Amino acid sequence: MQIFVKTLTGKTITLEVEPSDTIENVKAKIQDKEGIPPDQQRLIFAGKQLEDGRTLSDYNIQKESTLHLVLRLRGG
């Protein structure tokens, strides 16, 4: 399924994911496409910070949803 990741630069990127994927795996996909190290990535959905060990499904993230990406420490 496709999801959107809205960054703070005004760029939105698209990802192909499964609801069984971990949040950790999603951050790896973002590093693959944009080059951002996972430990700099804070992902937010429905007002919740997403935990690396949980899955998209745990958060009820459905197709065509948008996550918000905020960068910490170095990227923020």
PDB file of N, CA and C in Angstrom:
ATOM      1  N   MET A   1       0.842  -1.203   0.000  1.00  0.00           N
ATOM      2  CA  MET A   1       0.000   0.000   0.000  1.00  0.00           C
ATOM      3  C   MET A   1       0.880   1.257   0.000  1.00  0.00           C
ATOM      4  N   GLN A   2       0.333   2.345  -0.525  1.00  0.00           N
ATOM      5  CA  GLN A   2       1.087   3.606  -0.577  1.00  0.00           C
ATOM      6  C   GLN A   2       0.759   4.427   0.653  1.00  0.00           C
ATOM      7  N   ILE A   3       1.777   5.017   1.258  1.00  0.00           N
ATOM      8  CA  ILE A   3       1.550   6.056   2.269  1.00  0.00           C
ATOM      9  C   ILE A   3       2.390   7.277   1.922  1.00  0.00           C
ATOM     10  N   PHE A   4       2.077   8.404   2.532  1.00  0.00           N
ATOM     11  CA  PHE A   4       2.773   9.665   2.307  1.00  0.00           C
ATOM     12  C   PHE A   4       3.524  10.055   3.570  1.00  0.00           C
ATOM     13  N   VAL A   5       4.720  10.617   3.427  1.00  0.00           N
ATOM     14  CA  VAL A   5       5.460  11.133   4.565  1.00  0.00           C
ATOM     15  C   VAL A   5       5.731  12.608   4.329  1.00  0.00           C
ATOM     16  N   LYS A   6       5.069  13.474   5.096  1.00  0.00           N
ATOM     17  CA  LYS A   6       5.229  14.924   4.936  1.00  0.00           C
ATOM     18  C   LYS A   6       6.390  15.423   5.770  1.00  0.00           C
ATOM     19  N   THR A   7       7.420  15.957   5.120  1.00  0.00           N
ATOM     20  CA  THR A   7       8.555  16.489   5.878  1.00  0.00           C
ATOM     21  C   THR A   7       8.331  17.964   6.180  1.00  0.00           C
ATOM     22  N   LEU A   8       9.247  18.544   6.953  1.00  0.00           N
ATOM     23  CA  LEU A   8       9.146  19.957   7.306  1.00  0.00           C
ATOM     24  C   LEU A   8       9.733  20.873   6.253  1.00  0.00           C
ATOM     25  N   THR A   9      10.352  20.339   5.191  1.00  0.00           N
ATOM     26  CA  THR A   9      10.867  21.204   4.125  1.00  0.00           C
ATOM     27  C   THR A   9       9.790  21.604   3.128  1.00  0.00           C
ATOM     28  N   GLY A  10       8.623  20.970   3.139  1.00  0.00           N
ATOM     29  CA  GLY A  10       7.599  21.197   2.140  1.00  0.00           C
ATOM     30  C   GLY A  10       7.593  20.069   1.122  1.00  0.00           C
ATOM     31  N   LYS A  11       8.508  19.119   1.288  1.00  0.00           N
ATOM     32  CA  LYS A  11       8.528  17.925   0.456  1.00  0.00           C
ATOM     33  C   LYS A  11       7.749  16.789   1.129  1.00  0.00           C
ATOM     34  N   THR A  12       6.963  16.090   0.342  1.00  0.00           N
ATOM     35  CA  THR A  12       6.219  14.910   0.751  1.00  0.00           C
ATOM     36  C   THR A  12       6.737  13.762  -0.101  1.00  0.00           C
ATOM     37  N   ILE A  13       7.123  12.692   0.588  1.00  0.00           N
ATOM     38  CA  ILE A  13       7.529  11.549  -0.227  1.00  0.00           C
ATOM     39  C   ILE A  13       6.558  10.402  -0.057  1.00  0.00           C
ATOM     40  N   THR A  14       6.608   9.521  -1.043  1.00  0.00           N
ATOM     41  CA  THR A  14       5.708   8.379  -1.021  1.00  0.00           C
ATOM     42  C   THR A  14       6.505   7.106  -0.745  1.00  0.00           C
ATOM     43  N   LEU A  15       5.871   6.174  -0.064  1.00  0.00           N
ATOM     44  CA  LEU A  15       6.458   4.899   0.294  1.00  0.00           C
ATOM     45  C   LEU A  15       5.492   3.765  -0.072  1.00  0.00           C
ATOM     46  N   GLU A  16       6.051   2.621  -0.452  1.00  0.00           N
ATOM     47  CA  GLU A  16       5.233   1.403  -0.527  1.00  0.00           C
ATOM     48  C   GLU A  16       5.520   0.567   0.722  1.00  0.00           C
ATOM     49  N   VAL A  17       4.507   0.200   1.489  1.00  0.00           N
ATOM     50  CA  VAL A  17       4.632  -0.465   2.789  1.00  0.00           C
ATOM     51  C   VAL A  17       3.549  -1.518   2.967  1.00  0.00           C
ATOM     52  N   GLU A  18       3.710  -2.429   3.920  1.00  0.00           N
ATOM     53  CA  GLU A  18       2.593  -3.259   4.366  1.00  0.00           C
ATOM     54  C   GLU A  18       2.199  -2.894   5.801  1.00  0.00           C
ATOM     55  N   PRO A  19       0.940  -2.993   6.181  1.00  0.00           N
ATOM     56  CA  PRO A  19       0.567  -2.720   7.587  1.00  0.00           C
ATOM     57  C   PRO A  19       1.315  -3.561   8.601  1.00  0.00           C
ATOM     58  N   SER A  20       1.822  -4.733   8.246  1.00  0.00           N
ATOM     59  CA  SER A  20       2.674  -5.545   9.119  1.00  0.00           C
ATOM     60  C   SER A  20       4.095  -5.039   9.247  1.00  0.00           C
ATOM     61  N   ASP A  21       4.513  -4.034   8.488  1.00  0.00           N
ATOM     62  CA  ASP A  21       5.872  -3.489   8.655  1.00  0.00           C
ATOM     63  C   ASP A  21       6.042  -2.750   9.972  1.00  0.00           C
ATOM     64  N   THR A  22       7.213  -2.897  10.615  1.00  0.00           N
ATOM     65  CA  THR A  22       7.536  -2.145  11.819  1.00  0.00           C
ATOM     66  C   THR A  22       7.861  -0.685  11.512  1.00  0.00           C
ATOM     67  N   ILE A  23       7.680   0.144  12.543  1.00  0.00           N
ATOM     68  CA  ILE A  23       8.059   1.551  12.409  1.00  0.00           C
ATOM     69  C   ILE A  23       9.540   1.675  12.099  1.00  0.00           C
ATOM     70  N   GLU A  24      10.357   0.829  12.720  1.00  0.00           N
ATOM     71  CA  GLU A  24      11.769   0.744  12.387  1.00  0.00           C
ATOM     72  C   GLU A  24      12.015   0.496  10.904  1.00  0.00           C
ATOM     73  N   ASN A  25      11.327  -0.481  10.322  1.00  0.00           N
ATOM     74  CA  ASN A  25      11.452  -0.723   8.884  1.00  0.00           C
ATOM     75  C   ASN A  25      11.020   0.476   8.055  1.00  0.00           C
ATOM     76  N   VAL A  26       9.963   1.189   8.462  1.00  0.00           N
ATOM     77  CA  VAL A  26       9.554   2.398   7.738  1.00  0.00           C
ATOM     78  C   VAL A  26      10.671   3.442   7.740  1.00  0.00           C
ATOM     79  N   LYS A  27      11.365   3.653   8.863  1.00  0.00           N
ATOM     80  CA  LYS A  27      12.482   4.608   8.929  1.00  0.00           C
ATOM     81  C   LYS A  27      13.625   4.174   8.036  1.00  0.00           C
ATOM     82  N   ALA A  28      13.852   2.875   7.928  1.00  0.00           N
ATOM     83  CA  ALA A  28      14.863   2.389   6.980  1.00  0.00           C
ATOM     84  C   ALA A  28      14.462   2.720   5.545  1.00  0.00           C
ATOM     85  N   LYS A  29      13.189   2.564   5.180  1.00  0.00           N
ATOM     86  CA  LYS A  29      12.734   2.928   3.850  1.00  0.00           C
ATOM     87  C   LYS A  29      12.898   4.421   3.583  1.00  0.00           C
ATOM     88  N   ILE A  30      12.728   5.223   4.644  1.00  0.00           N
ATOM     89  CA  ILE A  30      12.904   6.663   4.448  1.00  0.00           C
ATOM     90  C   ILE A  30      14.392   6.936   4.250  1.00  0.00           C
ATOM     91  N   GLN A  31      15.264   6.235   4.975  1.00  0.00           N
ATOM     92  CA  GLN A  31      16.687   6.468   4.728  1.00  0.00           C
ATOM     93  C   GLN A  31      17.075   6.058   3.322  1.00  0.00           C
ATOM     94  N   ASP A  32      16.523   4.978   2.803  1.00  0.00           N
ATOM     95  CA  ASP A  32      16.745   4.507   1.452  1.00  0.00           C
ATOM     96  C   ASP A  32      16.358   5.480   0.356  1.00  0.00           C
ATOM     97  N   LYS A  33      15.322   6.259   0.579  1.00  0.00           N
ATOM     98  CA  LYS A  33      14.811   7.144  -0.460  1.00  0.00           C
ATOM     99  C   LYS A  33      15.346   8.558  -0.332  1.00  0.00           C
ATOM    100  N   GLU A  34      15.560   9.052   0.884  1.00  0.00           N
ATOM    101  CA  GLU A  34      15.924  10.430   1.144  1.00  0.00           C
ATOM    102  C   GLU A  34      17.285  10.589   1.799  1.00  0.00           C
ATOM    103  N   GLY A  35      17.844   9.505   2.335  1.00  0.00           N
ATOM    104  CA  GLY A  35      19.172   9.569   2.924  1.00  0.00           C
ATOM    105  C   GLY A  35      19.259   9.951   4.387  1.00  0.00           C
ATOM    106  N   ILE A  36      18.145  10.170   5.075  1.00  0.00           N
ATOM    107  CA  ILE A  36      18.091  10.604   6.467  1.00  0.00           C
ATOM    108  C   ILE A  36      18.352   9.474   7.438  1.00  0.00           C
ATOM    109  N   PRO A  37      19.343   9.526   8.324  1.00  0.00           N
ATOM    110  CA  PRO A  37      19.541   8.439   9.300  1.00  0.00           C
ATOM    111  C   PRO A  37      18.331   8.183  10.188  1.00  0.00           C
ATOM    112  N   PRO A  38      17.950   6.929  10.416  1.00  0.00           N
ATOM    113  CA  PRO A  38      16.805   6.594  11.273  1.00  0.00           C
ATOM    114  C   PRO A  38      16.825   7.231  12.643  1.00  0.00           C
ATOM    115  N   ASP A  39      17.983   7.345  13.300  1.00  0.00           N
ATOM    116  CA  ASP A  39      17.960   7.888  14.654  1.00  0.00           C
ATOM    117  C   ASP A  39      17.632   9.379  14.683  1.00  0.00           C
ATOM    118  N   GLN A  40      17.572  10.053  13.526  1.00  0.00           N
ATOM    119  CA  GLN A  40      17.160  11.447  13.468  1.00  0.00           C
ATOM    120  C   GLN A  40      15.665  11.586  13.219  1.00  0.00           C
ATOM    121  N   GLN A  41      14.993  10.479  12.937  1.00  0.00           N
ATOM    122  CA  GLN A  41      13.602  10.569  12.481  1.00  0.00           C
ATOM    123  C   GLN A  41      12.589  10.413  13.610  1.00  0.00           C
ATOM    124  N   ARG A  42      11.724  11.423  13.716  1.00  0.00           N
ATOM    125  CA  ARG A  42      10.562  11.320  14.600  1.00  0.00           C
ATOM    126  C   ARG A  42       9.329  11.281  13.699  1.00  0.00           C
ATOM    127  N   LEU A  43       8.548  10.223  13.765  1.00  0.00           N
ATOM    128  CA  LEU A  43       7.338  10.061  12.947  1.00  0.00           C
ATOM    129  C   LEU A  43       6.095  10.253  13.814  1.00  0.00           C
ATOM    130  N   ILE A  44       5.164  11.038  13.287  1.00  0.00           N
ATOM    131  CA  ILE A  44       3.942  11.349  14.023  1.00  0.00           C
ATOM    132  C   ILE A  44       2.703  11.006  13.208  1.00  0.00           C
ATOM    133  N   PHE A  45       1.709  10.393  13.834  1.00  0.00           N
ATOM    134  CA  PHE A  45       0.421  10.120  13.179  1.00  0.00           C
ATOM    135  C   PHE A  45      -0.696  10.248  14.198  1.00  0.00           C
ATOM    136  N   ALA A  46      -1.763  10.944  13.859  1.00  0.00           N
ATOM    137  CA  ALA A  46      -2.927  11.069  14.737  1.00  0.00           C
ATOM    138  C   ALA A  46      -2.442  11.566  16.100  1.00  0.00           C
ATOM    139  N   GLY A  47      -1.522  12.538  16.061  1.00  0.00           N
ATOM    140  CA  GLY A  47      -1.049  13.156  17.280  1.00  0.00           C
ATOM    141  C   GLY A  47      -0.159  12.289  18.162  1.00  0.00           C
ATOM    142  N   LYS A  48       0.239  11.120  17.711  1.00  0.00           N
ATOM    143  CA  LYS A  48       1.020  10.121  18.421  1.00  0.00           C
ATOM    144  C   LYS A  48       2.427   9.989  17.856  1.00  0.00           C
ATOM    145  N   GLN A  49       3.461   9.941  18.706  1.00  0.00           N
ATOM    146  CA  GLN A  49       4.795   9.640  18.194  1.00  0.00           C
ATOM    147  C   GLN A  49       4.888   8.139  17.974  1.00  0.00           C
ATOM    148  N   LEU A  50       5.369   7.679  16.830  1.00  0.00           N
ATOM    149  CA  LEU A  50       5.407   6.254  16.541  1.00  0.00           C
ATOM    150  C   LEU A  50       6.660   5.574  17.078  1.00  0.00           C
ATOM    151  N   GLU A  51       6.453   4.451  17.746  1.00  0.00           N
ATOM    152  CA  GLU A  51       7.459   3.636  18.417  1.00  0.00           C
ATOM    153  C   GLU A  51       8.118   2.625  17.498  1.00  0.00           C
ATOM    154  N   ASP A  52       9.444   2.551  17.435  1.00  0.00           N
ATOM    155  CA  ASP A  52      10.119   1.682  16.471  1.00  0.00           C
ATOM    156  C   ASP A  52       9.679   0.225  16.424  1.00  0.00           C
ATOM    157  N   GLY A  53       9.360  -0.402  17.558  1.00  0.00           N
ATOM    158  CA  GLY A  53       9.022  -1.806  17.642  1.00  0.00           C
ATOM    159  C   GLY A  53       7.608  -2.210  17.322  1.00  0.00           C
ATOM    160  N   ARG A  54       6.696  -1.264  17.217  1.00  0.00           N
ATOM    161  CA  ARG A  54       5.318  -1.465  16.820  1.00  0.00           C
ATOM    162  C   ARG A  54       5.186  -1.506  15.304  1.00  0.00           C
ATOM    163  N   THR A  55       4.019  -1.919  14.821  1.00  0.00           N
ATOM    164  CA  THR A  55       3.763  -1.949  13.384  1.00  0.00           C
ATOM    165  C   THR A  55       2.807  -0.841  12.971  1.00  0.00           C
ATOM    166  N   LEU A  56       2.762  -0.555  11.663  1.00  0.00           N
ATOM    167  CA  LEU A  56       1.767   0.388  11.171  1.00  0.00           C
ATOM    168  C   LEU A  56       0.349  -0.007  11.595  1.00  0.00           C
ATOM    169  N   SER A  57       0.058  -1.308  11.528  1.00  0.00           N
ATOM    170  CA  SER A  57      -1.280  -1.786  11.890  1.00  0.00           C
ATOM    171  C   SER A  57      -1.645  -1.491  13.347  1.00  0.00           C
ATOM    172  N   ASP A  58      -0.672  -1.539  14.240  1.00  0.00           N
ATOM    173  CA  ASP A  58      -0.900  -1.266  15.668  1.00  0.00           C
ATOM    174  C   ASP A  58      -1.497   0.134  15.833  1.00  0.00           C
ATOM    175  N   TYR A  59      -1.154   1.036  14.924  1.00  0.00           N
ATOM    176  CA  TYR A  59      -1.578   2.416  14.928  1.00  0.00           C
ATOM    177  C   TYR A  59      -2.768   2.690  13.996  1.00  0.00           C
ATOM    178  N   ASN A  60      -3.297   1.643  13.380  1.00  0.00           N
ATOM    179  CA  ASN A  60      -4.446   1.787  12.495  1.00  0.00           C
ATOM    180  C   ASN A  60      -4.134   2.732  11.346  1.00  0.00           C
ATOM    181  N   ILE A  61      -2.907   2.669  10.835  1.00  0.00           N
ATOM    182  CA  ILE A  61      -2.521   3.434   9.653  1.00  0.00           C
ATOM    183  C   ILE A  61      -2.937   2.663   8.399  1.00  0.00           C
ATOM    184  N   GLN A  62      -3.890   3.241   7.672  1.00  0.00           N
ATOM    185  CA  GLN A  62      -4.496   2.654   6.479  1.00  0.00           C
ATOM    186  C   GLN A  62      -3.894   3.212   5.194  1.00  0.00           C
ATOM    187  N   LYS A  63      -4.292   2.664   4.027  1.00  0.00           N
ATOM    188  CA  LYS A  63      -3.760   3.120   2.758  1.00  0.00           C
ATOM    189  C   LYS A  63      -3.992   4.616   2.565  1.00  0.00           C
ATOM    190  N   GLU A  64      -2.970   5.248   1.970  1.00  0.00           N
ATOM    191  CA  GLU A  64      -3.013   6.648   1.548  1.00  0.00           C
ATOM    192  C   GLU A  64      -2.996   7.611   2.727  1.00  0.00           C
ATOM    193  N   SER A  65      -2.661   7.131   3.921  1.00  0.00           N
ATOM    194  CA  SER A  65      -2.440   7.960   5.093  1.00  0.00           C
ATOM    195  C   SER A  65      -1.167   8.795   4.953  1.00  0.00           C
ATOM    196  N   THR A  66      -1.114   9.880   5.739  1.00  0.00           N
ATOM    197  CA  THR A  66       0.072  10.718   5.817  1.00  0.00           C
ATOM    198  C   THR A  66       0.705  10.695   7.210  1.00  0.00           C
ATOM    199  N   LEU A  67       1.994  10.377   7.259  1.00  0.00           N
ATOM    200  CA  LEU A  67       2.761  10.526   8.490  1.00  0.00           C
ATOM    201  C   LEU A  67       3.526  11.843   8.465  1.00  0.00           C
ATOM    202  N   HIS A  68       3.829  12.411   9.623  1.00  0.00           N
ATOM    203  CA  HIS A  68       4.629  13.634   9.676  1.00  0.00           C
ATOM    204  C   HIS A  68       6.037  13.301  10.133  1.00  0.00           C
ATOM    205  N   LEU A  69       7.051  13.768   9.410  1.00  0.00           N
ATOM    206  CA  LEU A  69       8.446  13.480   9.753  1.00  0.00           C
ATOM    207  C   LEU A  69       9.114  14.747  10.258  1.00  0.00           C
ATOM    208  N   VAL A  70       9.551  14.729  11.510  1.00  0.00           N
ATOM    209  CA  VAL A  70      10.294  15.821  12.144  1.00  0.00           C
ATOM    210  C   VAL A  70      11.693  15.313  12.451  1.00  0.00           C
ATOM    211  N   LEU A  71      12.732  16.104  12.180  1.00  0.00           N
ATOM    212  CA  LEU A  71      14.079  15.564  12.408  1.00  0.00           C
ATOM    213  C   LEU A  71      14.640  16.102  13.715  1.00  0.00           C
ATOM    214  N   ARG A  72      15.237  15.241  14.530  1.00  0.00           N
ATOM    215  CA  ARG A  72      15.872  15.669  15.767  1.00  0.00           C
ATOM    216  C   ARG A  72      17.394  15.790  15.681  1.00  0.00           C
ATOM    217  N   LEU A  73      17.965  16.422  16.693  1.00  0.00           N
ATOM    218  CA  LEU A  73      19.386  16.481  17.004  1.00  0.00           C
ATOM    219  C   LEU A  73      20.209  17.103  15.885  1.00  0.00           C
ATOM    220  N   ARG A  74      20.231  16.466  14.718  1.00  0.00           N
ATOM    221  CA  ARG A  74      21.051  16.977  13.624  1.00  0.00           C
ATOM    222  C   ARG A  74      20.190  17.615  12.539  1.00  0.00           C
ATOM    223  N   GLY A  75      19.095  16.945  12.194  1.00  0.00           N
ATOM    224  CA  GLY A  75      18.194  17.391  11.153  1.00  0.00           C
ATOM    225  C   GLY A  75      17.136  18.364  11.627  1.00  0.00           C
ATOM    226  N   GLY A  76      17.243  18.837  12.864  1.00  0.00           N
ATOM    227  CA  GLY A  76      16.259  19.764  13.396  1.00  0.00           C
ATOM    228  C   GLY A  76      16.870  20.797  14.324  1.00  0.00           C
TER     229      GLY A  76
END
